[PDB]
């Protein structure tokens, strides 16, 4: 159930005052992805470039090709091999490294590996891992940006 909104209220960043990003719908590279492009920016973020082909701003979310089931316990009551379905959330952003050099692609990618029997037997802990991860990310968004520029923890 992944469906973003037209203005996404961007997580707080150091020099940004109330930043929002307008999403336009885009066709995803796989058939297993939903992708949006950041067509325009709102808020007092100065210098932020929107989505081009050579300088992209893309938010794509993908499901695995083949689902994996939990399987069945063996003679010792132990399930031999627990595969894991991983869902992928990836942001590509055009970033300019040098004074005249051409845009490179900064990349922010998230992988959510859910074990096989998890999604059904223990859903609360799955949801809890996701909420803790995203809550820490949104809490420390500004500081993680500061670190991405400073190199300091």
Angle at 144 between CA 139 and CA 28, to 5 degrees: 90
Q: How far is the CB of 79 from its own copies (least distance, A)?
A: 5
Contact set for its own copies, span 35-74 (CB under 8 A) = 37-39, 41, 45-49, 51-57, 59, 61-63, 65-74
Contact set for its own copies, span 71-90 (CB under 8 A) = 71-79, 82, 84-85, 87, 89
- Which tokens in the block code for residue 34? 């939903």
């990618």: which residue's tokens? 109
Among 6, 17, 42, 136, binds its own copies (CB under 8 A): 136
- Which tokens in the block code for residue 135? 């809550």
Count of residues engaged in binding its own copies, rule: CB under 8 A = 130
Q: How far is the CB of 18 from its own copies (least distance, A)?
A: 11
Q: How far is the CB of 35 from its own copies (least distance, A)?
A: 9
CB 59 within 8 A of CB 91: yes
Q: How far is the CB of 114 from its own copies (least distance, A)?
A: 5
Among 6, 17, 42, 108, binds its own copies (CB under 8 A): 108
- CA-based nearest residue to 148, from 111, 100, 93: 93
Work out whether 27 is an interface residue with its own copies (CB under 8 A).
Answer: yes
Q: Distance (Å, rounded) from C-alpha 21 to C-alpha 8?
A: 5
Among 6, 17, 42, 129, binds its own copies (CB under 8 A): 129
> CB-based burial of residue 5 (10 Å sphere; 0-12 exposed, 13-18 middle, 19+ buried)?
exposed
- CA-based nearest residue to 112, from 92, 137, 95: 137
Q: How far is the CB of 142 from its own copies (least distance, A)?
A: 8
């Amino acid at each position: 159930a992944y469906s973003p909104s037209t203005p996404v209220t961007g997580a707080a960043q150091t020099g940004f005052t109330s930043p929002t990003y307008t999403l336009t719908s885009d066709t995803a590279p796989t058939a297993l992805g939903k992708q949006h492009a950041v067509t325009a920016t709102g808020g007092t973020q100065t210098g932020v470039t929107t989505h081009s082909v050579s300088s992209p701003f893309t938010i794509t979310f993908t499901r695995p090709k083949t689902m994996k089931t939990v399987g069945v316990p063996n003679s010792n009551g132990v399930i031999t091999n627990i595969g894991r379905n991983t869902y992928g959330f990836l942001v590509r952003k055009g970033v300019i490294p040098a004074v005249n050099q051409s845009p490179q692609v900064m990349l922010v990618r998230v992988e959510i590996s859910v074990p096989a029997g998890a999604d059904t037997y223990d859903a609360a802990n799955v949801k809890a891992a996701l909420s803790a991860a995203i809550g820490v990310l949104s809490q420390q968004s500004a500081g993680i940006g500061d670190t991405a520029l400073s190199g300091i923890l």
